[PDB]
C-alpha cells in the first residue's frame, strides 16, 4: 500500500490546466505516516561507576 517510489505519468488533468506551470513555479504536497518512527538516545554523565 505504498504510494511513493512509483512513476506517475500525466496525460490528462481534471482541470483545464494540462499541467502547464505558469510563471515557472510548481508545488508538491506530501504527507505520509508510515515512516514516522521516533528513535530515542541517551548520553552518560559519569562513565565510572558500575552501578
Amino acid at each position, epitope marked *: 500500500a505504498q504510494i511513493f517510489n512509483k512513476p506517475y505519468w500525466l496525460q490528462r488533468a481534471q482541470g483545464h490546466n494540462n499541467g502547464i506551470c505558469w510563471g515557472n513555479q510548481l508545488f508538491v504536497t506530501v504527507v505520509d505516516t508510515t515512516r514516522s518512527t521516533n528513535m530515542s538516545l541517551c548520553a552518560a*554523565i*559519569s562513565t*565510572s*561507576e558500575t*552501578t
Partner: antibody
Amino acid sequence: QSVKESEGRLVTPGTPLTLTCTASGFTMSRYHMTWVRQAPGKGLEWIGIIYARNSDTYYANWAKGRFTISKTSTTVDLKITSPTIEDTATYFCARVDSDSSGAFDRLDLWGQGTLVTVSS
Amino acid sequence: DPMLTQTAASVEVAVGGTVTIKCQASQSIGGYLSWYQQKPGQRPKLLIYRASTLASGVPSRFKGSGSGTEYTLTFSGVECADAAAYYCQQGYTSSDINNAFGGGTEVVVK
C-alpha cells in the same frame, strides 16, 4: 503536607528505641523518606534513605549495623539497636519530593522534630 | 564518594551587601544539588534545588548558578531575619558514601 513524629524519651544505653513518622496529606507509597540528625555545635548528619515501590534502603557508611528502617503503607519509622552516648541530638523526618527519574535527596517538606537523648 | 567540603566561615556583611558562598564537589554530580537555611531555633528550610529552580513562598532576590563540580549561591539586600545557617547538599544517592553534606554559617548582620 505536614510531617508528624513521636514524642521523645530520655533513655539508658543498651535499650532499643523507636520513632514513628506519620504524614498528613500525601500517601507514602508514592514518595520516599529519609532521616537526618541535628547534633549541637554544627551537627547535622544524614542517616539513610528508603524508596517507594522498590522499597529498597541505603544507609551511611558508618551507619550499617546500627539502624533499621521499617515502612508500612500507613506509617514509616526507624529503629536503633544499641545506642552510644553521643547520639543526644535532634531527629527529623521529611518527604523526598522527586521527579520521574531522580529520587535525589531534596527533602522539600520537613517535620517539626523532637528531642531524643540518652543518659547513664 | 562525592564530597562537598564547605570550609568557609562567613564574612561580616552589612545591610545590602552581596555574599558568595561556594560549594565545591570532588566527583561530578550533574545539576542535582540543594540548599537550605537553618535558623538556630527551629526546623531547617529550603530555598533552591537543582541550582536554578527556587521553591514556593521565597522571594526572587536569591540567585542560583554553577554547573559541573563547583556551585554558588548569591543574594543581595540582607534583611534582619537572614541570621541563620546555610548548607549545600547533593543528590547522587550513592551507597558507600558518608556525606552529611556539611559546612556553612552566617554571621549576625549589623
